[PDB]
């Protein structure tokens, strides 16, 4: 995955999450190929929000 | 660690102070805008500390 620097302060940051979801939908295969590197971003989003 | 424990402790401290400043603002009927601004400032502190 091309690196994504996101802190997830403001709720608008959800854009990034939605991006991945769309990428999971349009390109399930490629997403399967990069989903760990995606999970590093989501772990930040989750540790921040939940 | 994926996550810095010192930073996470600062997130808990800040969550506490946030609910504190909030409880004050509702006690003093403070305008929603200024409250959201104090919260955005606290979140920013969290990202900075992280």
Q: Approximately how much beta-strand content do the residues of chain A carry?
A: under 5%
Most extensive contact: A-B, 7 and 10 residues
Number of helices of chain A: 2
Q: What are the secondary-structure elements of chain A, in order, as H or E?
A: HH
Helix share, percent of chain A: over 70%
Alpha-carbon distance between the two ends of chain A: 24 Å
Radius of gyration of chain A: 11 Å
Could you explain how this protein is built, in words?
Chain B: Homodecamer; each decamer is made up of two conformers of VP2, called VP2A and VP2B. 12 homodecamers assemble to form an icosahedral capsid. This is part of a larger assembly, with two copies of chain A (about 50 residues). With about 50 residues, the first copy, chain A, is mainly α. Helices cover about 70% and strands about 0% of the residues of chain A. In chain A, α1 packs antiparallel against α2 (about 30-50). Chain A is globular, with a radius of gyration of 11 Å. The interface of A and B includes residues 7, 9, 40, 43 and 47 of A.
Layout of SSEs?
This is part of a larger assembly, with two copies of chain A (50 residues).
Chain A: H1 14-26, H2 28-49
Helix pairs in contact in A: 1-2
Family (chain A): Belongs to the turreted BTV-fold inner capsid family.
Organism (chain A): Bombyx mori cytoplasmic polyhedrosis virus
Protein name (chain A): Inner capsid protein VP1
């Amino acid at each position: 995955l091309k690196k994504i620097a996101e802190s997830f302060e403001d709720p608008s940051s959800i854009v990034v999450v939605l991006e991945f979801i769309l990428f999971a939908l349009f390109f399930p295969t490629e997403f399967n190929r990069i989903k760990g590197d995606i999970q590093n971003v989501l772990l930040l989003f989750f540790s921040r929000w939940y | 660690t994926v996550t810095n424990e010192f930073a996470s402790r600062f997130r808990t401290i800040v969550a506490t102070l946030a609910n504190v400043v909030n409880e004050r603002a509702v006690q003093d009927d403070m305008q929603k805008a200024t409250r959201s601004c104090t919260k955005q400032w606290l979140r920013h502190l969290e990202t900075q500390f992280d």
